Design a protein around this ligand. Structure first.
Ligand SMILES: COC(=O)[C@@]12OC[C@]34[C@H]([C@@H](O)[C@@H]1O)[C@@]1(C)CC(=O)C(O)=C(C)[C@@H]1C[C@H]3OC(=O)[C@H](OC(=O)/C=C(\C)C(C)C)[C@@H]24
Ligand SMILES: [Cl-]
Ligand SMILES: [Cl-]
Ligand SMILES: [Cl-]
Ligand SMILES: [Cl-]
Ligand SMILES: [K+]
Ligand SMILES: [Mg+2]
Ligand SMILES: [Mg+2]
Ligand SMILES: [Mg+2]
Ligand SMILES: [Mg+2]
Ligand SMILES: [Mg+2]
Ligand SMILES: [Mg+2]
Ligand SMILES: [Mg+2]
Ligand SMILES: [Mg+2]
Ligand SMILES: [Mg+2]
Ligand SMILES: [Mg+2]
Ligand SMILES: [Mg+2]
Ligand SMILES: [Mg+2]
Ligand SMILES: [Mg+2]
Ligand SMILES: [Mg+2]
Ligand SMILES: [Mg+2]
Ligand SMILES: [Mg+2]
Ligand SMILES: [Mg+2]
Ligand SMILES: [Mg+2]
Ligand SMILES: [Mg+2]
Ligand SMILES: [Mg+2]
Ligand SMILES: [Mg+2]
Ligand SMILES: [Mg+2]
Ligand SMILES: [Mg+2]
Ligand SMILES: [Mg+2]
Ligand SMILES: [Mg+2]
Ligand SMILES: [Mg+2]
Ligand SMILES: [Mg+2]
Ligand SMILES: [Mg+2]
Ligand SMILES: [Mg+2]
Ligand SMILES: [Mg+2]
Ligand SMILES: [Mg+2]
Ligand SMILES: [Mg+2]
Ligand SMILES: [Mg+2]
Ligand SMILES: [Mg+2]
Ligand SMILES: [Mg+2]
Ligand SMILES: [Mg+2]
Ligand SMILES: [Mg+2]
Ligand SMILES: [Mg+2]
Ligand SMILES: [Mg+2]
Ligand SMILES: [Mg+2]
Ligand SMILES: [Mg+2]
Ligand SMILES: [Mg+2]
Ligand SMILES: [Mg+2]
Ligand SMILES: [Mg+2]
Ligand SMILES: [Mg+2]
Ligand SMILES: [Mg+2]
Ligand SMILES: [Mg+2]
Ligand SMILES: [Mg+2]
Ligand SMILES: [Mg+2]
Ligand SMILES: [Mg+2]
Ligand code: NA
Ligand code: NA
Ligand code: NA
Ligand code: NA
Ligand code: NA
Ligand code: NA
Ligand code: NA
Ligand code: NA
Ligand code: NA
Ligand code: NA
Ligand code: NA
Ligand code: NA
Ligand code: NA
Ligand code: NA
Ligand code: NA
Ligand code: NA
Ligand code: NA
Ligand code: NA
Ligand code: NA
Ligand code: NA
Ligand code: NA
Ligand code: NA
Ligand code: NA
Ligand SMILES: [Sr+2]
Ligand SMILES: [Sr+2]
Ligand SMILES: [Sr+2]
Ligand SMILES: [Sr+2]
Ligand SMILES: [Sr+2]
Ligand SMILES: [Sr+2]
Ligand SMILES: [Sr+2]
Ligand SMILES: [Sr+2]
Ligand SMILES: [Sr+2]
Ligand SMILES: [Sr+2]
Ligand SMILES: [Sr+2]
Ligand SMILES: [Sr+2]
Ligand SMILES: [Sr+2]
Ligand SMILES: [Sr+2]
Ligand SMILES: [Sr+2]
Ligand SMILES: [Sr+2]
Ligand SMILES: [Sr+2]
Ligand SMILES: [Sr+2]
Ligand SMILES: [Sr+2]
Ligand SMILES: [Sr+2]
Ligand SMILES: [Sr+2]
Ligand SMILES: [Sr+2]
Ligand SMILES: [Sr+2]
Ligand SMILES: [Sr+2]
Ligand SMILES: [Sr+2]
Ligand SMILES: [Sr+2]
Ligand SMILES: [Sr+2]
Ligand SMILES: [Sr+2]
Ligand SMILES: [Sr+2]
Ligand SMILES: [Sr+2]
Ligand SMILES: [Sr+2]
Ligand SMILES: [Sr+2]
Ligand SMILES: [Sr+2]
Ligand SMILES: [Sr+2]
Ligand SMILES: [Sr+2]
Ligand SMILES: [Sr+2]
Ligand SMILES: [Sr+2]
Ligand SMILES: [Sr+2]
Ligand SMILES: [Sr+2]
Ligand SMILES: [Sr+2]
Ligand SMILES: [Sr+2]
Ligand SMILES: [Sr+2]
Ligand SMILES: [Sr+2]
Ligand SMILES: [Sr+2]
Ligand SMILES: [Sr+2]
Ligand SMILES: [Sr+2]
Ligand SMILES: [Sr+2]
Ligand SMILES: [Sr+2]
Ligand SMILES: [Sr+2]
Ligand SMILES: [Sr+2]
Ligand SMILES: [Sr+2]
Ligand SMILES: [Sr+2]
Ligand SMILES: [Sr+2]
Ligand SMILES: [Sr+2]
Length: 237
RNA sequence: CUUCAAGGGCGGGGAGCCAUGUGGACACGACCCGAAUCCGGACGAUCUACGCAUGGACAAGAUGAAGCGUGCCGAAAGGCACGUGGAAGUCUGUUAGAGUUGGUGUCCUACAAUACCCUCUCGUGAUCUAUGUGUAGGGGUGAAAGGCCCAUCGAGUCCGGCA
RNA sequence: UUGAGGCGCCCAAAAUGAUCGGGACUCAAAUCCACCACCGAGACCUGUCCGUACCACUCAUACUGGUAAUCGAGUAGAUUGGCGCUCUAAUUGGAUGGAAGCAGGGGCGAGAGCUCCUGUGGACCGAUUAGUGACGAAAAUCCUGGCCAUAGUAGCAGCGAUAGUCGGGUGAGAACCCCGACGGCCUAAUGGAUAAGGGUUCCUCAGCACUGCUGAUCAGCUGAGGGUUAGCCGGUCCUAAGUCUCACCGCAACUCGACUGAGACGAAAUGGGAAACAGGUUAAUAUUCCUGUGCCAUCAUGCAGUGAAAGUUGACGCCCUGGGGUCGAUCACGCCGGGCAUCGCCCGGUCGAACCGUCCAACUCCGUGGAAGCCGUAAUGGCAGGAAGCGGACGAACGGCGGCAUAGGGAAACGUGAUUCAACCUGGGGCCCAUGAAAAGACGAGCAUGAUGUCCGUACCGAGAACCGACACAGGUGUCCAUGGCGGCGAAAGCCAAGGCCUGUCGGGAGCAACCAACGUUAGGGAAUUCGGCAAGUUAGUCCCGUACCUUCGGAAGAAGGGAUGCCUGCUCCGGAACGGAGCAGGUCGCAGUGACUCGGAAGCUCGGACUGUCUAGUAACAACAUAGGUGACCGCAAAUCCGCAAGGACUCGUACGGUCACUGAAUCCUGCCCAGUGCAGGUAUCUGAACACCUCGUACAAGAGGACGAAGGACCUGUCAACGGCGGGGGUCUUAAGGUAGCGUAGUACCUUGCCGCAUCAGUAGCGGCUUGCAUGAAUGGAUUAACCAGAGCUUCACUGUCCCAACGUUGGGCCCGGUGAACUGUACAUUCCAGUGCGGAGUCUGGAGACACCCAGGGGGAAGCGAAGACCCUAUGGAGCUUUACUGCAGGCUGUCGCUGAGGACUCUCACUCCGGGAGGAGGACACCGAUAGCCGGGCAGUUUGACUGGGGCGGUACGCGCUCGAAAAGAUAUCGAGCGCGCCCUAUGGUCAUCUCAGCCGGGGACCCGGCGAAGAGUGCAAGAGCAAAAGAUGACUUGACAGUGUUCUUCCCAACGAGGAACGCUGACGCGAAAGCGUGGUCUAGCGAACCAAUUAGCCUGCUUGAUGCGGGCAAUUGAUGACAGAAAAGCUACCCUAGGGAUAACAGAGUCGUCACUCGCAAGAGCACAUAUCGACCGAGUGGCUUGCUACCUCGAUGUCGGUUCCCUCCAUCCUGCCCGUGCAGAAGCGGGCAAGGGUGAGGUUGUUCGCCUAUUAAAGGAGGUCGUGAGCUGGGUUUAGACCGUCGUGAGACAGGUCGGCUGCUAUCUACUGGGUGUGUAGGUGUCUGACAAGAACGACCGUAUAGUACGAGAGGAACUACGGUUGGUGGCCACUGGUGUACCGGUUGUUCGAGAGAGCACGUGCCGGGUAGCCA
C-alpha cells in the first residue's frame, strides 16, 4: 500500500512541524554556582504560544532578562529568589531537598541541572512526599511515584492557567486556531473511513475495522495502529 | 557387460576427413509489425494538494448576546421595564471576491482538449487571495473522492534496459 | 345392402405487394398408364496441337520416331525447371549518325517476361558465363509524399457590448484608412496607473508578397531608420519562511545525506528603508532632459562640542468606537467664460507644490485645589492611594497658518463661507485553550562653506489582438483608482459625465417561407403535463397591525394574515445642521404610486446528517469526509509514536490540564447479555522452546550423533467487548460463550408485498399514522429522540402559470438569394430503386418479378445492420496491475538468548572502559546500555509469485481427471457425449500351494438342529462390481506345505490399426524347493480393477572408486527393495477488482435476428358429465389431432476492428384469433336487456389515480374504451424514470479485500447527409411553330365514422313490472377540407398614461434587450 499518516509524521515536513519561529522561550532554570544571592523582580506576565499557560518575565540582580514558567499568584512587582537557601514562597526555585514534604511543586528536574522536565502544563503539580539522604519521592500529575535525586531543582506552587480543560471548544474553528499554534496535523480522518491502500482499517462496503483493534507491541510502523498494546479495553468489567 | 548357471545388451569381415551449394533443428531480435508490463537513472510542486513567510481583500442592510445604565418593586437575594452595548464558524446581499444546484438549455469538426447563458450557494471566517518558500514517485500531499503531484495517477514524466 | 380402389372437397387464422421462377394453363401447359420424336454439358466419339510419363535412337535431359482405354481439377504442404532486379569478374558487344528513362504503338513467349517502331530525352547501356544479394507487393486500421470527390459546401450570426449613416479627404483601387456631422456602445470598466510575463511589439518613413475570419491606401504584418538620460523612482542594503557554500561526520562511493559551526543567498506590484516638488519640452523619454525651488548622505575646511549611550524609534493581531482633519462632492453668494431662448434657467472656471517656519487636539505627567457623592462618556468608566475647577511640562496630521510666489499656470476671473468629510493624525473599549516578524537603519547628538554622489532598470503592451492557453482563443491572469452626477440602504439596478470606443471586426438582398436559437403576448380551463411542476411563472422594496405548533428558550419569525405607499400646498417634531430622519392638514391625477428598475411565493407531514465547513480540477456536492462532544489505548521524557542505510531527525522553545494511536460523532434519555474462537495484555508449578559455552560417543583432529541447562514464544491459567465480533435451534437443554434487555420496527433494513386498518383522492404499488410474529432491527459495528440548519430524498395544501387541453401571432439572430473568404468528416468497386425470395439464418449489387427519361433546389432524417472508437459486457490467454488474507515463499521491523566491546573484587559488591546530565567542579548510570555478529519467536508493514483442467459460455454443482464390468456399439477390430446400470484405491499365512477323500443348491419320503434314502449338470460355492470359467473340480472336507521363491527372458497388453513410460498378463529357460505313485501341478487368490517417473533418504549383498603416496575417517558408484506425487506419463501454491488494463474470440454468454415449440396462445376431433327432462341454449373433463410464432425455454447459425438498453413518447403501414359499429343464425328467443355462434378489418377503440414499469389494480365517462406484427417498429427523433461504471448508506454473507439476479440517494446522451428513400420546388431532353380548351390510362381518399334526442309510443309484446322497431326529423362527438362577416388571440403598426435618468425648465425626445412598464388596438395571420 501507501505509507500511513503516522509514517509521514516522522519525516518532519512543514505540515507536521511546530511553528518554532513563533515561539517565545525554552523555559529553563537559571544556572547558579552555589549560594543564594540571586533574586529578581517580575516585570511582565506574557502568553506563551507553545503551552497556552502564562509565562513570567523576570529581571535578575545581575541584569538578566529571561522568561520563566509562571506559577499561580505571581504578579508584577513581586520578588522571586533562586538558589539553595531560597525562601519557601510560591514561585521560588530551590532543590527538592530544601523543599518541605507535603508541598505542591512544579517544573521538576529529571537529572539535576537540566532545567525542568516534569509538571509544566496548565494547573498541574507534583507532590513531594518522602525524604532521605539518597532519594526524594515525588508524585507526578499522572499519580506515579517518581523516585528522584534531592539535588533536582523545582519551583514551588501549581502551574498557572488552571482549569483550561474545563470549558469546551464548542466549535471546530476554535480547535483550528489552537492547532495552528502546535505541532499537530488537524483534522483527523478515521482510518476506517479511508481506502485499504491507505490504512490497515481502510476498505470494505461499510465502515468497520478489518482485524481486531488491539495491536501487539512488536508490530512494525505501518501496522501499529488502533489500540497499541492495550492491557484491556472498554469501560465495564 | 551382467553372469553358479542361463538368458539378454552393446560392438565386430577397413571409409573416412575436408571443402562448396542446399534442406532442417537449437540459442540468440531469428520472416515483419502489432500491448498492457517490469526494472534503472534522471527531470518536474510555473498546474494542483498541504504547510510556512510577507502582503492584500470583504458596498450596504438585518438580528441585537454579554457587560453597563436609569426607573419601578424588594429586607435582601434579586426581579421587571426601558435604554445603552454591539457579540456572532449569525442572517439578507451578482460589494469585491469564492463556489458550482438545476436547465440534463447553448455548444459538442466548439470561442473553449471542460466554453456560454440563466438559475443557484458562501460571502468576518475551519474565509478568499498575490508573491516568496517547503514536501518527490511505492514517495509527497490528501476535512478521504484512490482525490491531487504541469491536458499525464489504483503508482508522474523523460530517456535507458529494449529489437 | 355392403366391400375395395382413383382424383378431388371440408378440416385450413398473421402481420409493406398474391403467386408454380414469372406469364399464364382446364378433352391441360394438371394427374396417372403407355408410346413417338426432339432440345440439351467441358461427359462420350472424332481432327490437330501442348504438357507429363514411359519406349527406341542418342553424349543429350538436343533432334526424330513411338506408346498412354488403363496421363492431364486441387487448398496446406513436399519436389523441380525457368523469368526479372543490383553490383563483381571473365568473354564479347552497342551509343552524340543519339545510351538509359518516359509516352504512344508493332511482334514473340502458356507465362514470369523479351524485343522492335515513332515521339521525348541528351549520356550512358548491354549480352553470355560464373558469382553477389539491403532482389520482385494490391493488401499489413502498413510508412512517406502527392492528388481527387466531398464543395464553392460548413464557419466568417448566437455572448445584455445587436452600430452604424450622410457628406468629404487620399488613392490605380475604398462598406470597413482619415476628416465632419448625425446615431450609438463601455462606468470596478471597454476609463487611468502598474506586477508578472512578453521583448522592440514603441516613433517615423516606405510598402502589400506574407499575416489580418471579407477588403485595405490601414496595421501588433514587410523593410529601413530612430527611440529608454535619475544622488533624492525602483534595484542596490536589511533581515523572513527558507536556500546554498565551506568545515565536520556518514556513505563502498558521489554530483548523496541529517546535525552543529562559520559565511553567503533569500522581498523590483506587496515586509524594513537617508533624500524631490512645480512647470516646460519630443515623432518617441522624463520626480531621469530643461527652468525654478528644495532636500539627503558622505567627505574637506572653519566654528561650535566634549557630551555618546542609556533610552527611543524601525516595530506590528482581530472586532467596535470617539476626536482632529485634507481631497472630493454638495449647498450659499460674488467674479470670469460658455450655453439656451416664452421662462431664467444650465454648464465650465474661479489654480498655485515640495520645502522652510509656526500652531496643537489626544495621551502621559506636575503644581494648585479639596469632592464623603460628585466628575465624565457613543460606551466602558474615574476619585481622600485626592474628583471637578485653575495653571503648567511633554506632545499630531499627507492638516491650519506665513513664506515658497512682482515662481508657475490661466483667454478670463485668478472667490469667500459652510456641511459631509477618503487620505493622513490621535485616542477609548472588547476578544483569544488563537497572543499577532526580524534585521539593517534612524533618533538620541549643532551650524557654515565646498566637493563627491559611481553601477543596473527606465521604450511599449499589460489584454474579447502585445501575457499563458498551438490562434489577433467568448477561457485564465495579481495590485492601486471603493468619494464623478441622479438614484437608493448601498461599491445595487437603471440613466449620464470625464476618458475610451464603433476592432467582442465580413458584407449586400428577400414583410424576410419551412425549420432552429433566444424571447413577448395568448381566451376558457388550471398540473389534466411529467418519474417528478422539469421549464416557466407567482411573490417581492418600505411602514403600520398582527403572528401558531414546537423549542436546546437562542429560535421558530419576514411564520401565516391584514392595511398603507404618487403628486401638490402649507406645516409640526428630533437634531448645531445636512442638499438628514420622523410625522400632520388640505388639495389632487391614473387601470395601476417599491408605477421602470431593484425586489421572498406561502404552509404542513416524513427520511438523513445535528449545525458553519469538506469532496471526486473534467458526468457523483450527497445521507459521504470534517466537526465540537463522548470513549478506549500507549507513554514519566534516556518516554510513547514516527523518519533515516548511517551520521542523525519530527514530535519538541513540548512534559500527563501533555501528545501519540484509534473508535463514535452536538445537546437530551440511555448504552443490556457473552471472554468459547480470534486479538491484546498479565501470570505460569509443570510441559515445549534455538544458537554459544559445557558434558558423552565419534574422529591422532574435523564432519557427525546424543545429553545437560534453558530466553522470548507456545501449551496452560487469568483479565479485557465504547477489542474483532456474537446474542439461535429444540423443549417445559443443544451447538459454540451468551440467547436480543431500553428502545425502534413492512424501515434508505421486510423476501413474501401494492402486508392489514385508518387518513387523503372520483380513483393513491406513493406519502403519513397505527398494528407489526423483525426473510435478515437493536444499543459508541452506538439505540432512541430532537429544536435549529440544508442547491440532500419522498408526500400534501393554498397561490401561480402555455407543463397540458391545443395550439396562434409577434420579436431578435440564423436559416434562403448575391459578393468575398473557404475547411473537415468520409470514399473496394459499381450504384434510379421497390416487393418477395435466396444466401454465413438481418441483400441497392444474387433469383423472380414490379418500377424507373436526365439534371438541379429546399427539407425532415426511413435505410446504407450510416459515420465516430481493434466492445468497457462475457469468455479465453500456463496476459498485466492495484488490493486482501490464518495462500506459497521470503524481506524489513520488534522481542529474546548468546559472542565481541568488557574491567576489579546462581546470587552480589565495585569502578577504569562505555552512556547520559552539568558551563565547570562535578553528578547519574556502569560492565549493563548503545553498537557490531549470530540464534529462536512474532512479523501482508513490504516484495515476488501461485491460486490447474473438464464443462451444450462462465460460476455453482459434479469429475464422464488413474483404473474394472454390462449396455450404448450397428453379430471381426475400433468407436463419442455432464450416455444407462455400478464398481476399484483392498482384503487374505490362508482366504496361497499340492495331495487325498468327496459333491452342491432346492425338493420328496423315514426317524427349519442331526441321521438314512431317493430326485437333482449346477439354480450351490468360488473374499468384493459386473460379465465370464468350473462338478470324479476351479467347489467342500482333511492333511501336508510355503512357488506369495531367486535370477533372466520371450510375447502380448498398456497404446486395435500405429509411435509412447510405469503397471499388467500369458508363455519359457537357469537355480532351489513343496506335493504326488507318477504323469503333473505351484512364476499367489478361476479371469478381467486393487496403482506411481527423476532427484533424495533408508535398507540388502558383493564389488568398483575418491586428484603424488601409505594408514584411518568420511565420501562417490554398479544391482535392487521401501517412502508419493489420486490434477494418478508427477509444479512446492489462496482470493478481490464496479478503479481497472492488454491481447483476442461471435472459437463462447447478455439484446436481437434465425431454427425448434416442450412452454405459451388459439383451434379442431371424440363427448363422459350437468344443464329440473333433455350432450350438443349454455358449460364441458379425459384422451386424441393441429395452427401460430404474442410468452417462456432450448440451440449456439449470424454480429464481439460495437447492428446503442427497458419503459414511455411521436409518426407511419399492417394482421384477425372482432371489443364496438353493419348484416346475420340459435336460444333455457314474450318484450326490454342478454347469452352463444357466423360473415366482416371501412371506421373507432378515448381521459385519468398509485407504480420507471411492460403487466396489472383502481375511478368516472363510453357505441366499445379488442388483441397483435413492423430489429420485443421508432435514441444520425425525443425522454433518461428503471437495468448496468466510477461516490455513499442499510441488511445479509465474508477473517479480509469485497460480494449480492437485495434495497436506497447521486451520477454524461457525439456527427456540417456522399448514396438511397420520401415530401414539395425547379431546369432540360423526348413525343415534333404557337395560344386556349380538354381527354383519362392509371393514382390517392375514411371523407366520412359513431352516438344522443323527438315523433312512431307509454304504442307492439307482457298478468304486471317493464317496454321495443320501420320511418321522418333535430342535434352532438371524432375525423376531414376550407374560410375570417361574427366571437376570440396576436398585432416590439399605431395612440394614450406613467416611473428613473439625460438633453437647463417648457415643448419635444433618447435609453431602461432588443416595446421600461401599464391601457386600448387596425390590417393580416389565426381557433
Ligand atoms: C454502438 O453499439 C453497438 O453497436 C452495439 O449494438 C447493439 C448493442 C449490442 C452490440 O450488438 C453492439 O456492440 C448488443 C446487441 C449485443 C448483445 O449481444 C447483447 O446481449 C446486448 C445486451 C446488446 C445491446 C446493445 O448493447 C450495448 O451495450 C451495445 O452498445 C455498446 O456496446 C456501446 C456503445 C453504444 C458505445 C459506448 C460504444 C450495442
Ligand atoms: Cl487538543
Ligand atoms: Cl519454363
Ligand atoms: Cl522600477
Ligand atoms: Cl472615547
Ligand atoms: K456484437
Ligand atoms: Mg523549556
Ligand atoms: Mg499548522
Ligand atoms: Mg474524524
Ligand atoms: Mg472510500
Ligand atoms: Mg495492507
Ligand atoms: Mg458507521
Ligand atoms: Mg462503524
Ligand atoms: Mg505557483
Ligand atoms: Mg437594540
Ligand atoms: Mg471505492
Ligand atoms: Mg561470353
Ligand atoms: Mg518496390
Ligand atoms: Mg498478398
Ligand atoms: Mg451537401
Ligand atoms: Mg443598437
Ligand atoms: Mg503609414
Ligand atoms: Mg480579436
Ligand atoms: Mg390561458
Ligand atoms: Mg424550478
Ligand atoms: Mg429643532
Ligand atoms: Mg421511506
Ligand atoms: Mg451535513
Ligand atoms: Mg465529478
Ligand atoms: Mg452541495
Ligand atoms: Mg472526538
Ligand atoms: Mg457520518
Ligand atoms: Mg407504510
Ligand atoms: Mg455494547
Ligand atoms: Mg475486441
Ligand atoms: Mg497479477
Ligand atoms: Mg548529549
Ligand atoms: Mg502481495
Ligand atoms: Mg475453462
Ligand atoms: Mg465390435
Ligand atoms: Mg521431488
Ligand atoms: Mg527407507
Ligand atoms: Mg494426465
Ligand atoms: Mg493414460
Ligand atoms: Mg480488452
Ligand atoms: Mg457464433
Ligand atoms: Mg444504426
Ligand atoms: Mg373470421
Ligand atoms: Mg385498415
Ligand atoms: Mg398521464
Ligand atoms: Mg424496440
Ligand atoms: Mg431509427
Ligand atoms: Mg443518440
Ligand atoms: Mg444528429
Ligand atoms: Mg428512482
Ligand atoms: Mg438510481
Ligand atoms: Na511483469
Ligand atoms: Na507550488
Ligand atoms: Na441588554
Ligand atoms: Na453554473
Ligand atoms: Na512511481
Ligand atoms: Na498447392
Ligand atoms: Na473590418
Ligand atoms: Na505644517
Ligand atoms: Na455559513
Ligand atoms: Na471470547
Ligand atoms: Na446484529
Ligand atoms: Na451548505
Ligand atoms: Na409561449
Ligand atoms: Na436517413
Ligand atoms: Na490495477
Ligand atoms: Na496449478
Ligand atoms: Na511393459
Ligand atoms: Na406449430
Ligand atoms: Na423505447
Ligand atoms: Na375494421
Ligand atoms: Na435493434
Ligand atoms: Na429508447
Ligand atoms: Na440519445
Ligand atoms: Sr540544556
Ligand atoms: Sr528542558
Ligand atoms: Sr475495513
Ligand atoms: Sr458493560
Ligand atoms: Sr509556488
Ligand atoms: Sr457589513
Ligand atoms: Sr443532472
Ligand atoms: Sr453558441
Ligand atoms: Sr461538453
Ligand atoms: Sr431557461
Ligand atoms: Sr449570504
Ligand atoms: Sr458569516
Ligand atoms: Sr525501449
Ligand atoms: Sr379471415
Ligand atoms: Sr492440368
Ligand atoms: Sr495437376
Ligand atoms: Sr525487399
Ligand atoms: Sr521529397
Ligand atoms: Sr481540396
Ligand atoms: Sr454581424
Ligand atoms: Sr494601463
Ligand atoms: Sr494588392
Ligand atoms: Sr502602432
Ligand atoms: Sr541578501
Ligand atoms: Sr517596498
Ligand atoms: Sr469626524
Ligand atoms: Sr479578461
Ligand atoms: Sr469559466
Ligand atoms: Sr463620453
Ligand atoms: Sr477585418
Ligand atoms: Sr397586448
Ligand atoms: Sr401532479
Ligand atoms: Sr403583505
Ligand atoms: Sr475543486
Ligand atoms: Sr449523543
Ligand atoms: Sr479471549
Ligand atoms: Sr423482543
Ligand atoms: Sr435483378
Ligand atoms: Sr438538413
Ligand atoms: Sr447458461
Ligand atoms: Sr491362475
Ligand atoms: Sr475465499
Ligand atoms: Sr460502489
Ligand atoms: Sr357486434
Ligand atoms: Sr399525474
Ligand atoms: Sr415486455
Ligand atoms: Sr404486478
Ligand atoms: Sr407498436
Ligand atoms: Sr437513468
Ligand atoms: Sr427494481
Ligand atoms: Sr441489484
Ligand atoms: Sr432519347
Ligand atoms: Sr311505467
Ligand atoms: Sr428600445
Amino acid at each position: 500500500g501507501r505509507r500511513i499518516q503516522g509514517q509521514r509524521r516522522g519525516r518532519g515536513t512543514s505540515t507536521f512541524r511546530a511553528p518554532s519561529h513563533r515561539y517565545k522561550a525554552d523555559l529553563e532554570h537559571r544556572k547558579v554556582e552555589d549560594g543564594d544571592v540571586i533574586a529578581g523582580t517580575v516585570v511582565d506576565i506574557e502568553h506563551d504560544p507553545a503551552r497556552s499557560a502564562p509565562v513570567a518575565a523576570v529581571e535578575f540582580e545581575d541584569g538578566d532578562r529571561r522568561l520563566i514558567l509562571a506559577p499561580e499568584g505571581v504578579g508584577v512587582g513581586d520578588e522571586l529568589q533562586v538558589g539553595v537557601s531560597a525562601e519557601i514562597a510560591p514561585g521560588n526555585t530551590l532543590p527538592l531537598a530544601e523543599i518541605p514534604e507535603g508541598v505542591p511543586v512544579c517544573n521538576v528536574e529529571s537529572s539535576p541541572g537540566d532545567g525542568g522536565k516534569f509538571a509544566r502544563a496548565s494547573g498541574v503539580n507534583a507532590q513531594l512526599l518522602t525524604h532521605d539522604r539518597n532519594v526524594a519521592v515525588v508524585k507526578l500529575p499522572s499519580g506515579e511515584m517518581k523516585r528522584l535525586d534531592p539535588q533536582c531543582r523545582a519551583t514551588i506552587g501549581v502551574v498557572a492557567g488552571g482549569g483550561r480543560t474545563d470549558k469546551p471548544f464548542v466549535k471546530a474553528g476554535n480547535k483550528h486556531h489552537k492547532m495552528k499554534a502546535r505541532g499537530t496535523k488537524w483534522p483527523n480522518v478515521r482510518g476506517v473511513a479511508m481506502n485499504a491502500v491507505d490504512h490497515p482499517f481502510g476498505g470494505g462496503g461499510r465502515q468497520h475495522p478489518g482485524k481486531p483493534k488491539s495491536i501487539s507491541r512488536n508490530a512494525p510502523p505501518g501496522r501499529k495502529v488502533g489500540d497499541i498494546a492495550s492491557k484491556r479495553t472498554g469501560r465495564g468489567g
